[PDB]
Amino acid sequence: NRPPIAIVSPQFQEISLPTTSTVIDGSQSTDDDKIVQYHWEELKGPLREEKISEDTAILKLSKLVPGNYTFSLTVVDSDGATNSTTANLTVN
């Protein structure tokens, strides 16, 4: 009964706007059984009129303001074991 292995890639990224739109793949989630869901939550971000809550494997970002970002991918398997790995995104 191995717990899932959550591998978010790329881990570190440097992006300078008029191309704020950035995607970090989260589909590289190793487990014996099916990954029932993916959960994305941004722990830290500069104040923005919106807050990042999604369930997609490939997270889509748009309208990124300058600052430092730290996103957290939480995966759950069939049994229920959860492994959370954090991703750091930086915009110039």
Partner: protein
């Protein structure tokens, strides 16, 4: 054989045996000497330049080719009436091309005085590309085909092909077919030419409009025992989701389960004949469907067989989705709307989506109102389908052929294709009737007394004349519908007018007023 003996009699009758329509035709041809008997190459670099889209590289062969792939070469408008009024389809079955009665004439120009005396010795070459090892150029309605009115004497169009072109410069694959490298046949004013050609098994053309809309194919009196989802909320309020089905009967035929769906669609821009309604900007080129292989655009003209307009919108027509023939006496370019006659396609609005409409809509997200840990409250949003590819069980109807419309078109020799029916209308044949390229041989004027190794560029001007006869037996599929309401037919209006339709004017110019479709009878789906 011999100067004083005609080499073939003028056949022009049109027999109607019954289930076979042999339509002979004969017109007098005059063929000049094109390009001074040379093979000058053509490119936009020589024609003064062109856009990126219009670049081409090809050779201007001096041969003239007889083209007869237009329906009015053979069918007198009365025959075309007898063939659209009561017939459910037709297809060519054989061919017979007698080229007879050549006479070659020599033109002498002394002090600007034209004296034309015939050469009882000069020869004119004829041969048929009977293996299609030449670039097939019949099949774009190139305006050189046989004269609508029999008496009309016509000039044989020049033969010039196109090959690959990176800009205006050729590439290694660019082929150069030398026509004389083919075994010709030499006729010298007493001979005649004749080849018989057997048309391959090409499917019967659809000479009928459907009298049952594809979305009204059901029975209007009985329910359908296939429940459809009707309601999703009980009533206006908070947290009132539900799921109520109901039977799909005659009271609601929209949601009725159906076996088949309308044919493909490639949306065209909409332009209205009432010039006031069109937008006040030049959207001729920018804003029309184009397919653009190899990085150069090209209008999707006329594209996939699609109905021109929804029932009742007669004035409209797609930008680049209908054959638009020019009436006799019209200018080459920048003619007004009334001097060109437009072929509307309302005849297959049953089993084809409207050309200017957007073929339904497809849902783009999930209507999961309340989600577990990722709440979005996303309503079911729908997006349109501007272009739709062929799916499982989809039916459609190919484009119509008009009296002034093409017959055949070679199916490009490719590793695969789907439903090869040439989009301009007609029959798709892997082995169409061959080209018949005719050239009158050079006869050098007077070479020097001293030797000279050049190409002997001084030839004496001359041309040719004769007759050409194309007997092409069609096969009919008679109609046996048990319809009781009188059929709809094609007629010429009984009302006094200055000229009879399809009859010569006071000056002698043969005028065809309107394009004649071939879908008049009605056959239920």
């Amino acid at each position: 054989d011999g100067v004083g003996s005609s080499s073939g009699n003028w056949h022009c009758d049109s027999q109607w045996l019954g289930d076979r329509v042999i339509t002979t035709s004969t017109r007098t041809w005059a063929l000049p000497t094109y390009n001074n008997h040379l093979y000058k190459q053509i490119s936009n670099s020589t024609s003064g330049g062109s856009s990126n889209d219009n670049a081409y590289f090809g050779y201007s062969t001096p041969w003239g080719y007889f083209d007869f792939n237009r329906f009015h070469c053979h069918f007198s408008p009365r025959d075309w009436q007898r063939l659209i009024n009561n017939n459910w389809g037709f297809r060519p079955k054989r061919l017979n091309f007698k080229l007879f009665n050549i006479q070659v004439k020599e033109v002498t120009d002394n002090n600007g005085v034209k004296t034309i005396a015939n050469n009882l010795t000069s020869t004119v070459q004829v041969f048929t590309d009977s293996d299609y090892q030449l670039p097939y150029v019949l099949g774009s309605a190139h305006e050189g085909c046989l004269p609508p009115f029999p008496a009309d004497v016509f000039m044989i169009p020049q033969y010039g092909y196109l090959t690959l072109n990176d800009g205006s410069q050729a590439v290694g694959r660019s082929s150069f077919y030398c026509l004389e490298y083919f075994p010709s046949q030499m006729l010298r004013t007493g001979n005649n030419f004749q080849f018989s050609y057997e048309f391959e098994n090409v499917p019967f053309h659809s000479s009928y409009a459907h009298s049952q809309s594809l979305d009204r194919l059901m029975n209007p009196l009985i329910d359908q025992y296939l429940y459809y989802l009707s309601k999703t909320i009980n009533g206006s309020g908070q947290n009132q989701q539900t799921l109520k089905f109901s039977v799909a009967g005659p009271s609601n035929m929209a949601v009725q389960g159906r076996n088949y769906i309308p044919g493909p669609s490639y949306r065209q821009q909409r332009v209205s004949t009432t010039v006031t309604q069109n937008n006040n900007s030049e959207f001729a080129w920018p804003g029309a469907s184009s397919w653009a292989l190899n990085g150069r655009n090209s209008l999707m003209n006329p594209g996939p067989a699609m109905a021109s307009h929804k029932e009742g919108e007669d004035r409209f027509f797609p930008l680049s989705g209908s054959l638009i023939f020019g009436k006799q006496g019209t200018g080459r370019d920048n003619v007004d709307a009334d001097k060109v006659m437009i072929t509307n396609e309302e005849e297959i609005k049953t089993t084809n989506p409207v050309a200017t409409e957007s073929y339904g809509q497809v849902a783009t997200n999930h209507q999961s109102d309340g989600t577990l840990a990722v709440p979005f409250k996303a309503q079911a949003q729908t997006g349109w389908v501007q272009n739709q590819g062929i799916l499982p069980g989809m039916v459609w109807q190919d484009r119509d052929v008009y009296l002034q419309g093409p017959i055949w078109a070679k199916i490009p020799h490719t590793d695969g294709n789907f439903h090869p029916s040439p989009l301009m209308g007609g029959f798709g044949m892997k082995h169409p009737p061959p080209q018949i390229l005719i050239k009158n041989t050079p006869v050098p004027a007077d070479p020097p007394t001293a030797f000279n190794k050049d190409k002997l560029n001084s030839f004496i001007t001359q041309y040719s004349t004769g007759q050409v006869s194309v007997e092409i037996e069609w096969e009919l599929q008679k109609e046996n519908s048990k319809r009781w309401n009188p059929e709809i037919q094609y007629t010429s209006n009984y009302y006094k007018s200055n000229n009879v339709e399809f009859a010569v004017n006071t000056e002698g110019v043969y005028s065809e007023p309107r394009p004649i479709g071939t879908r008049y009878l009605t056959r239920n789906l």
